[PDB]
Ligand binder design. Structure first.
Ligand SMILES: [Mg+2]
Length: 264
C-alpha cells in the first residue's frame, strides 16, 4: 500500500476551504460521520485513520517506530504533503489535538487554524500543574485493559461517551474492539506519558479550544491553562455537551461550535 491507502485517507466534499478531521485513540475516522453533513458542501474534508486504528492493517503498527507522538506527527505531515491541498483548518480530538499542536510547530505554513477537542498537553499532575491523574492512578485502567479487554471496553465505553447515547456507545465499542489489545495498551501508555507543556508557547497559529465537560481525561480547568500557554491567538469554547466524544454523542451541537470556530 501507499501511505494514503494504509491510513485509509479520504477526501470528501466540494468546496475550496480545506478541513482536516483527526480522530483520537479508540476511534477511527468514522467517529466524524455525523459531523460531515455540516461541512462537505463548502469544504474539501480530509479524513484519515491513525496507525493504531483497528481499521488499519495491524502489520503497520511497528512498536520500534511509534514510541512518541512525533512518529504520529510524521504520518500526518506525510499525508498532508501527499494530498497537496495546502493551507488548512485542522480539527484534532484528544491525542490528535496534541498531534496537531506538534505538527503546527514543524509546519505552521500548512495550518490556518487548529480546533482542539479534548486537548491535554499532559495527563499526569506535576509540581504545580493539574493534569487530572496522580502518580499510580492510571495503573488500575492499564491492569483492567490487559486482564480482560472485553470487560474493560464494556465499562469504559459508557464512561467515555458520558451521556446515555446508545448509538455512541455502539460506535466507540466497535472501534475499541477492532483494535489489537496490545496496541491499545501500548499507545494508551505512550499518550498517557506525553508532555507537550514546554512547546505550547511555540505555537503561532490561532487555536480554538473546545473544552469537553465531565471528560474522564481532561479537567475543565485545562482550557484556561491552554489559553494562557498557547503562543498564538487562543479562544475557549466550554462545550455544553457531556463526555469525551462530543462529535459522536451530540454531533449537531458539536458541529455548530466547530462551524463558529472556522477561520476565514
Ligand atoms: Mg504569539
Amino acid at each position: 500500500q501507499s501511505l494514503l491507502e494504509a491510513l485509509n485517507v479520504r477526501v470528501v466534499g466540494s468546496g475550496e476551504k480545506v478541513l482536516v478531521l483527526a480522530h483520537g485513540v479508540g476511534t477511527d475516522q468514522s467517529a466524524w460521520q455525523r459531523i460531515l453533513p455540516y461541512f462537505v458542501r463548502d469544504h474539501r474534508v480530509v479524513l484519515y485513520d491513525l496507525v493504531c486504528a483497528g481499521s488499519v492493517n495491524p502489520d503497520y503498527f511497528d512498536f520500534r517506530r511509534y514510541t512518541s507522538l512525533d512518529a504520529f506527527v510524521d504520518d500526518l505531515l506525510a499525508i498532508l504533503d501527499a494530498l497537496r491541498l495546502g493551507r488548512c483548518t485542522y480539527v484534532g480530538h484528544s491525542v490528535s489535538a496534541s498531534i496537531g499542536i506538534l505538527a503546527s510547530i514543524r509546519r505552521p505554513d500548512l495550518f490556518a487554524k487548529l480546533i482542539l477537542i479534548g486537548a491535554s498537553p499532559r495527563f499526569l499532575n506535576d509540581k504545580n500543574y493539574h493534569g487530572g491523574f496522580a502518580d499510580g492512578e492510571i495503573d488500575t485502567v492499564f491492569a483492567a485493559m490487559e486482564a480482560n479487554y472485553a470487560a474493560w471496553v464494556s465499562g469504559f465505553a459508557p464512561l467515555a461517551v458520558g451521556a446515555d447515547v446508545p448509538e455512541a456507545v455502539r460506535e466507540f465499542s466497535r472501534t475499541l474492539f477492532n483494535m489489537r489489545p496490545d496496541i491499545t495498551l501500548f499507545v494508551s501508555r505512550m499518550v498517557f506519558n506525553s508532555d507537550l507543556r514546554g512547546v505550547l508557547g511555540l505555537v503561532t497559529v490561532p487555536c480554538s479550544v473546545l473544552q469537553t465537560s465531565k471528560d474522564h481525561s481532561v479537567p475543565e480547568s485545562m482550557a484556561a491553562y491552554l489559553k494562557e500557554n498557547l503562543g498564538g491567538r487562543t479562544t475557549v469554547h466550554m462545550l455544553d455537551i457531556e463526555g469525551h466524544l462530543p462529535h459522536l454523542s451530540a454531533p449537531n451541537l458539536l458541529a455548530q461550535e466547530l462551524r463558529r470556530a472556522l477561520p476565514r
